[PDB]
Each structure stands twice: as structure tokens, then as C-alpha cells.
Design a protein around this nucleic acid. Structure first.
Ligand code: K
Ligand code: K
Ligand code: K
Ligand code: K
Ligand code: K
Ligand code: K
Ligand code: MG
Ligand code: MG
Ligand code: MG
Ligand code: MG
Ligand code: MG
Ligand code: MG
Ligand code: MG
Ligand code: MG
Ligand code: MG
Ligand code: MG
Ligand code: MG
Ligand code: MG
Ligand code: MG
Ligand code: MG
Ligand code: MG
Ligand code: MG
Ligand code: MG
Ligand code: MG
Ligand code: MG
Ligand code: MG
Ligand code: MG
Ligand code: MG
Ligand code: MG
Ligand code: MG
Ligand code: MG
Lengths: 87, 110, 245, 85, 97, 288, 95
RNA sequence: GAUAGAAAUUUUUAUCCUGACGCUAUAGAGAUAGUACCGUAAGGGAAAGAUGAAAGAAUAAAAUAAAAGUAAAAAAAAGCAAAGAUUACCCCUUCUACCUUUUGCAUAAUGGUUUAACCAGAAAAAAUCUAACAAAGAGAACUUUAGCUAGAUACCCCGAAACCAG
């Protein structure tokens, strides 16, 4: 007898149909498109501009990091107040 | 794993000493590990059984056992209890003698 | 001549190179085989683990008997416990009763999936090749060509050379297998053609004779000797590595 | 034997065939959009991230709407989006 | 305990059919294939049991998670009762404890 | 070598019909059948033993359990938020260099240690990097530019004796996961993010010059280095006169993760090309 | 103790043990004396000192607490400025 | 207290290769069938098939003649029915049925007329045994001061009065 053809993982990009109701949810997320670019990029057929946060997203990122993560000057002066207070 | 770089002086500061260029004229042979260290290890069972294991041995293992027996005889005053596993090529010695064996095999160039 | 560095304390093992273009076209050269693959320790118990593993790693049973909960009926007490004069029962579907379920039976599709560590599987291939070579069951064929597509040619060729009852023919790649060999072995049961990637322990022990092609021999030594001096996988090797594409 | 399409999607696929398919697109688009209504009973918290008073650590917080029952009597009038709790 | 009085027709099993000759051919696809496909990507069977193993409780839980929404009404109920009984038996019963 | 291969020629061929497991590897299972394991099956006689309804684990029969009569004290209070540092010994650092696992010609940081299999970092288990310990300070003869997340007085002194450079830098768990496993990150198709500042608790450690902090004022390093040389009585080498001064003076921006890379860059490994942003807001956000 | 959970099927832990015990990597467990905060004016100076001291647990108690907690709490931890960091490993134990 | 238990953040390459270390008439669906039959009603719900190429070969043919139960062939002092034996079946000598439950049962304590079919130990945290590789192991995510990965060794059946909803 002759053996069956070996199973090989194709290197071509894949794109499931968004309109198919049976497609997995994780295969339509924006993270999947970015992963295809990091896998192939040239053959992925996705604009490289989608990898950076949009203006609406950038404003959200700017506010969240500012309000929660303080500045080095604020941290340095905050510790001075406590050191003076305890002393 | 990269090969160890050549050093102008031996042994290296970490104690590593490369094998001798010619193969020693002895029946048995002890291969180095994939990390280029002597394959002598400790092993503890039941929490109170202490054993030393010599792995990766090719050739006449019984020659290795006899050379170990008279090497450790003056230190203990008696022949140590050993197990020979020819199907694997592993000599098992009852007790913690890993440091003494590693120096002994290093002098013989394995 | 062996390409990968043979260990200093040992020497390579050698075997004849044969050709299938003729009945008497045997011993047409000499090839060196790496000692760490074709001359390793004869581990006949590391073959048992791999041979059993290839048999009980994809077995998914399909036996599911219905316990007393899944039976159709028997939701009522058959008779009052006291005063009837018979043994007390609580359902007519208990395992005691005739039509009842199974107290302890095969439950649902059961999967037997366990993966041996990779270095044991690699060690399984090395010992199988050494056993085949040590018992004169390994023959090296140069480029694996046949004069004709007639399947009777292989039958008489194996009979003349005493290649046993079954012969396993290998090739480096699927698309590169010549038409004469494919058509000759497609009509035979004891003679089978498998690509180099489809080689394993169970196939070797099934067929009494193993035939390796010279390009495949270099392929096997390159793949099997890489595990001796490798690192543990930080991430799976399908991902890019510095010196392992 | 199992269903090829999950049971939860049977109602959604009911709209894609038959008379429901010929319905005007603008009506269907508004129907499929299930936006969260304005909170009436429960009091939401504005911040998406909050600091645990016991733990003194940054943690994520999410608003979960409180289910409310709308009796059929409500459909005849204007209750402002509220009902029995 | 009465046994059959006639010899049954002996089963002529051929050890060299297509299934047995090609059995376990590509088991080493990962080792000899640049590690592109794990050998667990050749298992044929249930969706929730491809490359997975467990006891009876972990199997029933796993089945409910993946294909639970695609099961029939009666099968969905029987699975729930099986999970509850196994949960009570494994934790609240036994000898070693 | 393998003299057992000579014996295999005389013996018959090895096939599936004659295979035996290693003796002792498979202990046989005992089933409750027969006189020995029968009529009780190893359970007992009546009670909660034979009927399998004995109480939970740690229940002493109505009496207050041992684990409930001990007063609560905080041993694991907030353990999930305490920082952990994997220790690296100079004995192992010397061992790696001698075997070629790492090289002193190229600057060494956390990434190079991981690729050398020296230390393994699990960001999930609240690991904030590698701390340098002084276990092998006496026999350390290497000259490296090593960057760690915590250092000791003797470990710093031992390296500076040979003429090395030691610097401590803080890595956020979001950044530390990227740093320890760079290749998996580059396959996620996301821009390289800025490295976050240390919290208020860890500001003094990385700001003082005694710890060779990355955020410390460079003007106070030379006087701090000489104090260690005076304290341990070793002559301080003039590092500016060595031919590897360019390599030994290499550092990272506090907002920078890798060597020579910048936040906002996208590494397209398939095409072997590096992408850079152009918008003013994108450049400002990734550089502030 | 929940040997098999109903969500993931893994082995759960008892939160009572961790809130009042410390496990050293050598297998020894650490605990406080019972009654070290109750009626201090009544007890003598020596008795109060004895109740304020950390104590070890014997084999049965140590073995019992290992089957009540999962394997996450038996790992090797390298805390910064940990007072018990030097007590993790045993030494000079001739058994 | 019993126990309950997330997320941020990560991973997942397509089609064929689908069949069976699943059962064979007390098994497998309840099924030859929700039909007979028992209930006013909701509801409960079975047993049942066997010749051969041709029975348009029924002065018809082949197959085991093997379960308990009877017939061929009723019984002859004496005893847990048997053993030691013996020229000889008894006669002689020696032995307080079997399980369960108990401090202790031939007990006049429990259960069984006998036969066939069916009916009851199941889980891998720590450990021991065997092996791979070893200051590192694992085909990612973890464990590491001789350890890590893989295999093998494990914890039953029948039964209440009741409780809640429709
Ligand atoms: K039935
Ligand atoms: K249990
Ligand atoms: K017994
Ligand atoms: K009675
Ligand atoms: K009784
Ligand atoms: K009885
Ligand atoms: Mg051990
Ligand atoms: Mg029922
Ligand atoms: Mg009822
Ligand atoms: Mg009942
Ligand atoms: Mg049935
Ligand atoms: Mg047992
Ligand atoms: Mg069992
Ligand atoms: Mg009995
Ligand atoms: Mg009993
Ligand atoms: Mg009792
Ligand atoms: Mg009480
Ligand atoms: Mg760790
Ligand atoms: Mg039937
Ligand atoms: Mg039957
Ligand atoms: Mg009869
Ligand atoms: Mg008598
Ligand atoms: Mg008596
Ligand atoms: Mg009594
Ligand atoms: Mg008793
Ligand atoms: Mg009686
Ligand atoms: Mg009684
Ligand atoms: Mg009776
Ligand atoms: Mg275990
Ligand atoms: Mg109640
Ligand atoms: Mg009621």
C-alpha cells in the first residue's frame, strides 16, 4: 500500500466569513487581525495603521494612565511630606 | 547548546575542566552531560536513604564497579554497597559520595 | 561519509549500499552510519513504552451503558415496604431487577490520551533502528528506482535476496516518490511505501525488513541527533528560533 | 446526535428567513440593537476602576443591572421605564 | 450453562489490510516535521475529547462546557443529574479521607 | 561499545509478539474477588467506614478542630501583592560565562539571562525581576555590564573590583512579561508600550546612588563607587580607559524596554522590517 | 475539603488554614499559641511570654494541613525583606 | 464554619482522511410497542423470534439428548447422611449443617425449595516501584538548595417514614 499524504499546516493566511452565524467569536475580534499581521503581514492584507490606537482610544489611554499612574515629581514630593511628617 | 569556549588556562574559575583530548585507555567510558558536566548525582528515597548515581556509562560496567570499590575502601574501611544496571548503564552507590566521585572521574579524564 | 560530528571515543558503523535496478545489483558501495543513532544501546523496554503508546494514545472508546438514572421509567415504589411479605424495593429499574441499569459499567466515550516525553520517543526511534541493523534487517537502497511497474518484480526480488515476508520502503518526501515504485507497491499488502515523516516504531516492528534510502538516512540522522544537545523549549519550536527555523 | 446550530441562535436565525427576511432593513437594524437602558432602580458607579478599602489595591468594578418586572398593566400607560422589583 | 453444540465459522482475519498495515504511520509527525503539528492533531473522535484525558467527573463537566448548548433537552437533563451525583459521591463519600 | 548488540545476532528478531515491560514498573492491581479480598473488600465492619459516610477532612467528632482553635495571625496577609525576586548567585554567573551560555562582550540584561537558561522568571507569580546575591563574590573574575532589578552591597563591590558596571532597573509586570518572552510578544501584533514608573514604595531604592539605581543622578555615581572601593580595600579601575567603554556605558531610557528599540514600534518578523508611527499625538504619547 | 470542584474539576483549598498558619519550604508549619490575647492580667509573666511565642506542629498536624491546601502554597517563594526567608531550608539534619 | 470563587492579561491553521479493544433476544432503546393490560383521570406499562439452497422436499428433514423436576428402578433397625474403610450397599468406628451477627450460636437467633440468566470498589494531592533527562526538567503558561516529566499502584450495592413544586 501507499501511505496517505502527510498532514501539513498551511502557511497561508486565513479569514473566516464574518456573516456566517457559526463562526467562532474569537475569530472575529480585532486581536485576531493583529495576530495575522504578526504572522504574515505582507500576505495578511490588513492595513498597518489599525495596529495603533485610534484618536478616540488614544484619549482614553491618555486619561487612564494619567489619573492612575502619577508622575515622578509627584511621587518624589509625596514621600518628602511623609518623611517630614513622621520625623 | 553552544560548545564551551576555549580558555587559555584551566581549570576555569567556576571549576569546569574540559575532557582530555585523547580517549583514556580504559574499558569503560563515561559520557559528559549535554551541559558538559560529570554525570554524578544524588538521590534520596524514603527521606533517609542516600544514594549516588553514575549515569551514561558505556563499555564494561563491572570494571567501573571494581575501580569504585577499591577507591572508596580506604575512606570507609569497607567495600561500599553498589548496584550495577547493565540494561541502563548506571552504577548506584549507597551514600553521598558525589563530590569525591566527580574529582576522581575528572582526574581520569572522562 | 557522516556529516555531523561523530563522538571521538567511538567510530561510525558501516553498511552496504544496495540498488533495486537489478536482482544482483547489490553491494554497490559503502556508507557510514552515525554510532549515536544506528549503534546505540539496545533498549528493548523503551520500545515497549513507545509501541504501547502508539496503540493507546488515540483509542477513544464508544461504550456507554445506561445507569439506573437514565433508564426510561421506574419512578415509583413498586409495593409498600411493610406488610406485603416480599423484599423491599424502591424502583423497578435498580441494578438488581431484570430490566435495570448497570451499577458499574462503561460510562460515555472514554479517552486514553497520554504523551510520553519527547526525548523518550526520540530514544524509541534510535533503538528500533539499531535493533534492525544489528539483526541484518536493515538494507540501504540508493535512490529507490525500479525497472518496471509490475508488482511481481518486487516479490521475486525480495525472494531472491531473502528480505523476509514484509518490506517497509521509505522515501524522503511524498511528491518525490517515483511512479514505478508507487505503482508497484500500490498493489501489494506486505510491501508498503511510506514517506520519511511517517516512520515510527510500530511500523518497523510490523514489517520484518526495513529499507532506508540514502537521502532519508541523512534526514534521519540530522533530525534524531539534534535532541542530544538541545535546550528545553521556552516556547514551542513552531515559533521562530535563533538557529532552528 | 447534537444540533449543528446552538439552541440560543434559533430565534436569531428565525429572522433571516421567510417573511422576516423581506422586512425593511432600517426596522431590522433598530430591532437587533439591544442597548442597555438608562438605570432607574440601581445606582451605578461612575468609575470603571475602584480602590478596595480593605485591600488598598486597584481593582476592576462593573455595573450589573437589577432585573425589573414589567406587568401588562404598564403597557397601557407611561411609567417612565420602571416597574415591580 | 449450556454451551453451543456447533463449531462457529472461524473468523479469517487478515493482518495485512489497509487499516493494520498503515496503523500508526504519522505518530512522529512532530518529531520529524520541524514541529509543525503536534501528534494530538490527528485524533478523530468527539470534539471535547481530542487530546484530553480525565476521570468521569471532569469528562462530564467538559462536555457540558463545549457542546452543552447543542445538546437535546432530555440529554441536557441527564447530564446535569450525572454531574450532581458524581460531585456528591467524589467529595462526600469514600474510604480514604 | 555496546557488546549487547553482538548477542542480538544470535537471538531471534524483535517483534510485537515478544515485548516485556521493565520488571517492577507495573504493580498489579488487586480486585475484591476471592477469599482474601472478599466479603469485606477491605472496608470494615459497620459504622461510617463500611458505608463510606465518614466526616470531612479535619473534623474530630464534635470537638473543636485543631485548625479552628488557633488564633488568626497574618502570615500570608497580602502575600499576593508582595514583590518576589529570583536570586542569581555570582557562582552561577561565573558558571554561565565559562560555558558560553552568556558572553561578556555583549551587554547582559534580564533577556540575555533567560535565553541562556540561567534564570526563569514567572511574571504571573508576582516576580519583579532578578536580584544579585553575593554567594560567589570571592571567585568572581569576570568583567560584565549586568543590569538587574535588585543588588547587594557585596555583589556590587565584587563586580566593580574587576571593572564592571552594575545598574538596577524596575520593570512593571506588563513590561516584564514582554521582556522575558520577547518573541511571543512580537507575534501578538501590538506596539511596544512604555515602561511604567516604579511605585512610591520603590522610588527611594532606584533613586539613591548607593543601589546604582537607573533613575539616580549620574553625578553621584563616581563618589559612591569610590566609597565601596575604600570600604573593601580594592583599587578602583579607570573604566574610561578600557577598549569596551562604549559597550559598558550602554543604558536604556526609563521609558524604553529593549536595546535600540522605541515605544510605538511594530516588529513585523515575517518581513524582517520595523514599523514606526508618524502622527504627532502617537509620537508624543509613546515618548512622554 | 472539595477534592473535585464543579467548575474546573481541580482540587480546592481551605481558606481557614492559610489565614492562621505559615508553611515553611522544609515541610514544617508555623502557628501562634492559643489564648495569647485573652485575660492577660490574670496570667503570670512567664505564662504570657510562653503564649506569645511561635511554635511548630507535629507530623500528624503537618500531614493533615498538607492535604487541606492545594499545591500553590507549597511553592518556593523569594520575598523581599522576608523575616522567615532564612528559615525556609533545613540544615544539618542527620536522620 | 461548611463551602462558594472571578477578571485584567494570554493560547487555539483550513477540507478529506468515520467509524467501533459498543451490545447480540433476562444484553442493547420501554419497543415486534407506548401496542396489549392495570387505572374514572394525570399516569404506569410488558413477555414475546430460531429447520433448509427449495416446505410449489410435513409417508418431511437435521441437530445436544447434558440444568432443576419425573420415568426406567417405592422401602427393610442406627441417626447433620459423610468419611476411615471393607471380599461385601448397609451393619462397625469417628464427626453439634452453612452464611450473617456476637463476649459466646448445632442452637429453639437471621436468611435460603432447588436450577439457569442477571446483580455489588470508582477518583492519583503527598507518597513507593520503573524509566527519560539532569542543576536543570516539561511539545509555552509551571515546579526547582537532586530535582522535574511520563507510566503503574485508590476509596461498593439494595432499602426508609418524609420534604418541595406542578
Ligand atoms: K425491557
Ligand atoms: K473521597
Ligand atoms: K477479607
Ligand atoms: K427471632
Ligand atoms: K439481627
Ligand atoms: K444472611
Ligand atoms: Mg529522586
Ligand atoms: Mg427516574
Ligand atoms: Mg416519590
Ligand atoms: Mg428510595
Ligand atoms: Mg437495558
Ligand atoms: Mg488494595
Ligand atoms: Mg481498582
Ligand atoms: Mg460469602
Ligand atoms: Mg455486615
Ligand atoms: Mg460498630
Ligand atoms: Mg458540644
Ligand atoms: Mg519561579
Ligand atoms: Mg429485549
Ligand atoms: Mg443474554
Ligand atoms: Mg434435565
Ligand atoms: Mg451408621
Ligand atoms: Mg458449640
Ligand atoms: Mg447477646
Ligand atoms: Mg467484633
Ligand atoms: Mg436457624
Ligand atoms: Mg435479629
Ligand atoms: Mg426461612
Ligand atoms: Mg502524585
Ligand atoms: Mg426543610
Ligand atoms: Mg406539596
Amino acid at each position: 500500500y501507499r501511505a496517505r499524504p502527510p498532514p501539513r499546516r498551511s502557511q497561508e493566511p486565513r479569514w473566516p466569513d464574518p456573516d456566517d452565524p457559526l463562526t467562532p467569536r474569537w475569530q472575529l475580534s480585532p486581536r485576531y487581525a493583529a495576530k495575522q499581521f504578526a504572522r504574515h503581514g505582507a500576505a495578511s492584507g490588513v492595513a498597518a495603521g489599525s495596529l495603533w490606537p485610534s484618536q478616540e482610544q488614544l484619549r482614553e489611554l491618555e486619561a487612564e494612565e494619567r489619573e492612575w499612574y502619577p508622575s515622578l515629581a509627584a511621587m518624589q514630593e509625596s514621600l518628602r511630606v511623609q518623611q517630614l511628617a513622621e520625623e | 547548546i553552544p560548545r564551551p569556549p576555549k580558555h587559555e588556562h584551566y581549570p576555569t574559575p567556576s571549576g569546569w575542566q574540559p575532557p582530555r583530548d585523547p580517549a583514556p585507555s580504559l574499558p569503560y567510558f563515561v559520557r559528559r552531560s549535554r551541559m558538559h558536566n560529570i554525570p554524578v548525582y544524588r538521590d534520596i528515597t524514603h527521606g533517609n536513604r542516600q544514594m549516588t548515581v553514575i549515569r551514561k556509562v558505556e563499555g564494561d560496567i563491572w570494571a567501573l564497579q571494581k575501580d569504585v570499590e577499591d577507591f572508596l575502601s580506604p575512606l570507609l574501611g569497607k567495600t561500599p554497597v553498589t548496584q550495577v544496571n547493565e540494561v541502563t548503564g548506571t552504577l548506584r552507590v549507597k551514600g553521598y559520595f558525589d563530590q569525591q566521585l566527580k574529582a576522581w572521574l575528572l582526574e581520569k579524564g572522562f | 561519509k557522516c556529516e555531523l560530528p561523530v563522538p571521538a571515543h567511538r567510530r561510525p558503523v558501516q553498511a552496504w549500499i544496495e540498488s533495486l535496478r537489478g536482482y544482483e545489483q547489490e553491494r554497490v558501495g559503502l556508507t557510514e552510519l552515525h554510532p549515536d543513532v544506528f549503534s546505540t544501546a539496545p533498549r528493548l523496554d523503551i520500545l515497549h513504552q513507545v509501541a504501547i503508546w502508539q496503540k493507546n494514545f488515540k483509542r477513544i472508546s464508544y461504550a456507554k451503558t445506561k445507569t439506573r438514572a437514565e433508564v426510561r421509567g421506574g419512578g415509583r415504589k413498586p409495593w409498600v415496604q411493610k406488610g406485603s411479605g416480599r423484599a423491599r424495593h424502591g424502583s423497578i429499574r435498580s441494578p438488581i431487577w431484570r430490566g435495570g441499569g448497570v451499577a458499574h459499567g462503561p460510562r460515555g466515550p472514554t479517552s486514553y490520551y497520554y504523551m510520553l516525553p519527547m526525548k523518550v520517543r526520540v530514544q524509541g526511534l534510535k533503538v528500533a533502528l539499531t535493533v534492525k541493523l544489528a539483526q541484518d534487517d536493515l538494507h540501504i537502497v540508493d535512490s529507490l528506482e525500479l525497472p518496471t511497474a509490475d508488482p511481481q518484480y518486487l516479490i521475486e526480488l525480495a525472494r531472491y535476496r531473502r528480505w523476509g515476508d514484509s518490506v517497509l520502503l521509505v522515501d524522503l518526501e511524498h511528491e518525490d516518490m517515483p511512479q514505478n515504485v508507487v505503482a508497484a507497491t500500490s498493489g501489494l499488502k506486505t510491501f508498503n511505501l511510506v514517506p520519511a515523516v511517517g516512520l515510527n516504531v510500530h511500523s518497523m516492528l510490523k514489517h520484518q525488513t526495513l529499507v532506508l534510502t540514502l537521502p532519508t538516512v541523512a534526514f534521519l540522522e540530522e533530525k534524531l541527533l539534534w535532541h542530544n544537545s538541545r535546550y528545553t523549549p521556552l516556547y514551542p519550536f513552531r515559533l521562530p528560533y535563533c538557529d532552528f527555523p | 446526535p447534537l444540533h449543528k446550530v446552538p439552541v440560543g441562535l434559533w430565534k436569531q436565525l428565525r429572522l433571516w428567513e421567510g417573511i422576516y427576511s423581506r422586512l425593511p432593513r432600517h426596522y431590522l437594524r433598530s430591532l437587533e440593537e439591544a442597548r442597555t437602558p438608562t438605570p432607574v432602580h440601581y445606582r451605578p458607579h461612575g468609575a470603571k476602576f475602584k480602590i478596595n478599602p480593605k485591600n488598598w489595591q486597584r481593582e476592576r468594578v462593573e455595573d450589573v443591572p437589577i432585573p425589573v418586572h414589567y406587568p401588562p398593566e404598564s403597557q397601557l400607560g407611561l411609567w417612565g421605564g420602571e416597574g415591580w422589583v | 450453562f449450556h454451551v453451543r453444540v456447533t463449531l462457529p465459522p472461524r473468523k479469517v482475519v487478515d493482518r495485512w489490510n489497509e487499516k493494520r498495515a498503515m496503523f500508526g504511520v504519522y505518530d512522529n509527525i512532530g518529531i520529524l516535521g520541524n514541529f509543525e503539528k503536534h501528534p494530538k492533531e490527528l485524533i478523530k473522535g468527539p470534539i471535547w475529547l481530542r487530546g484530553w484525558k480525565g476521570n468521569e467527573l471532569q469528562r462530564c463537566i467538559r462536555k457540558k462546557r463545549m457542546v452543552g448548548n447543542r445538546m437535546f433537552i432530555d440529554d441536557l437533563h441527564n447530564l446535569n443529574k450525572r454531574i450532581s451525583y458524581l460531585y456528591k459521591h467524589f467529595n462526600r463519600h469514600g474510604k480514604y479521607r | 561499545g555496546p557488546r549487547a548488540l553482538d548477542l542480538l545476532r544470535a537471538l531471534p528478531r524483535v517483534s510485537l509478539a515478544n515485548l516485556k515491560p521493565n520488571p517492577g514498573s507495573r504493580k498489579p492491581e488487586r480486585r475484591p474477588r476471592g477469599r482474601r479480598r472478599g466479603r469485606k473488600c477491605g472496608r470494615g465492619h459497620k459504622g461510617e467506614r463500611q458505608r463510606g459516610t465518614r466526616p470531612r477532612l479535619g473534623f474530630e467528632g464534635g470537638q473543636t478542630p485543631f485548625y479552628l482553635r488557633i488564633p488568626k495571625y497574618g502570615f500570608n496577609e497580602g502575600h499576593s501583592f508582595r514583590h518576589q525576586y529570583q536570586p542569581l548567585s555570582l557562582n552561577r554567573l561565573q558558571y554561565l560565562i565559562d560555558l558560553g551560555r552568556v558572553d561578556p562582550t555583549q551587554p547582559i540584561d534580564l533577556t540575555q539571562l533567560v535565553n541562556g537558561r540561567g534564570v526563569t522568571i514567572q511574571p504571573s507569580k508576582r516576580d519583579y525581576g532578578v536580584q544579585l546575591v553575593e554567594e560567589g563574590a570571592d571567585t568572581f573574575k569576570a568583567k560584565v555590564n549586568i543590569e538587574v532589578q535588585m543588588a547587594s552591597e557585596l555583589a556590587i563591590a565584587a563586580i566593580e573590583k574587576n571593572g564592571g558596571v552594575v545598574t538596577t532597573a524596575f520593570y512593571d509586570p506588563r513590561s516584564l512579561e514582554i521582556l522575558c518572552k520577547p518573541v511571543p510578544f512580537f507575534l501578538r501584533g501590538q506596539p511596544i508600550p512604555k515602561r511604567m514608573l516604579p511605585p512610591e514604595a520603590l522610588v527611594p531604592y532606584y533613586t539613591d546612588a548607593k543601589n546604582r539605581g537607573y533613575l539616580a543622578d549620574p553625578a553621584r555615581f563616581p563618589e559612591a563607587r569610590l566609597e565601596l572601593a575604600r570600604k573593601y580595600g580594592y583599587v578602583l579601575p579607570d573604566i574610561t580607559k578600557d577598549e569596551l567603554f562604549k559597550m559598558l556605558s550602554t543604558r536604556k531610557d526609563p521609558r524604553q524596554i529593549f536595546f535600540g528599540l522605541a515605544p510605538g514600534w511594530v516588529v513585523n518578523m515575517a518581513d524582517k522590517k520595523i514599523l514606526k508611527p508618524t502622527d504627532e499625538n502617537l509620537l508624543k504619547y509613546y515618548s512622554s | 475539603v472539595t477534592y473535585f470542584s464543579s467548575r474546573k474539576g481541580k482540587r480546592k483549598t481551605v481558606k481557614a488554614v492559610i489565614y492562621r498558619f505559615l508553611r515553611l519550604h522544609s515541610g514544617l508549619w508555623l502557628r501562634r499559641k492559643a489564648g495569647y490575647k485573652k485575660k492577660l492580667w490574670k496570667k503570670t509573666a512567664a505564662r504570657k511570654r510562653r503564649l506569645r511565642e511561635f511554635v511548630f506542629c507535629n507530623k500528624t498536624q503537618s500531614k493533615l494541613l498538607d492535604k487541606m491546601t492545594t499545591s500553590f502554597w507549597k511553592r518556593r517563594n523569594w520575598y523581599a525583606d522576608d523575616p522567615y526567608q532564612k528559615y525556609q531550608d533545613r540544615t544539618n539534619l542527620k536522620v
